[model samples]
Target: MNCFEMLRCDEGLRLKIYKDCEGYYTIGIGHLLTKSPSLNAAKSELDKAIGRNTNGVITKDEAEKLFNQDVDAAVRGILRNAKLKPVYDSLDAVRRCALINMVFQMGETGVAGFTNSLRMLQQKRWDEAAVNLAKSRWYNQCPNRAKRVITTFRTGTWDAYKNC
Candidate 1:
């Protein structure tokens, strides 16, 4: 299991923070001692150890902050992972965005783990690269998203939503 699954299984999913064995306000996938939540927890107001959080909930505003933070990091990872640079330089914005999404999904190191897939990209073999990605575990996990991304790789084109 990956980090998401493993953590979810280990920590148990809940909408509000609960004390761990040591009385730390923890929430969301084994995060210990932190009242600051990334996923599920009593919404922003519960920070003061205030109320019974059954009344609290996560909001898009809070989650978007987490998303924005990760997007910056993911783009930087895409820029820094030398293995990605060859194709990164050649692809248009759309294909590049798909690559960035891939980087986000697998992380920079995991992107490199797509060794043959990367090789296909570096060689400018668009069809091969797209085909490879479609056959990957990433694609196996999410077909619709994978198809959109794979199409960008295959066609060397993109749109704001689909490529993103």
Candidate 2:
């Protein structure tokens, strides 16, 4: 499957605004609304998509659309990183999806900060990459998601979050 399918399991779905772990206002499969217009537009579009006329809620289909858009933005942001672009291109679909999944959760900047891990991934040193992932503060902050992501990186499979 693709990143979106994996994300549906990993990120889960939310139809209404809620506070994220970091206390940021979020909706529609992890879409952050605490930021500016790009984030504000997200709320607006969802309202329009479901013809809610400015309600605080959206439909499943609308959330799916927003999820796809968020995924697109994350992938684009990842690709825009000079250091990540080549590494991202060298990987297979599953590995790519795993990388995108990380970017989706943590942002490109957060993932980009994994310097040695990125190097190991670029070198296809799976175990080394996984080790580096486990050593990070991110692993401690969100152990469940981090462990699943690390498993995907280590095994290069789509089964890491298969059961959600």
RMSD of 2: 3.5
Give the top-scoring candidate (TM-score).
2
RMSD of 1: 10.1
By summed lDDT, the worst window of 10 consecutive residues in model 1 runs over 1-10
Q: Write the per-residue lDDT of candidate 2 for residues 1-164, one digit (tens) a residue.
A: 67778877777778787765544667878876654435466567556655666467877777787788889988899889987798899998889988898888778888899999999999999999999999988888778888888899899887777665
Query: Model 1, range 1-164, lDDT digits (tens) per residue?
Result: 22232223333444445764334555433333354444344344444333334345434344334345555676787778788877678776656767776675556887878888788877779898878887777777657656766776777654424312
lDDT of each: 0.58, 0.81
Question: Where does model 2 exceed 4 Å of error?
Answer: 35-55
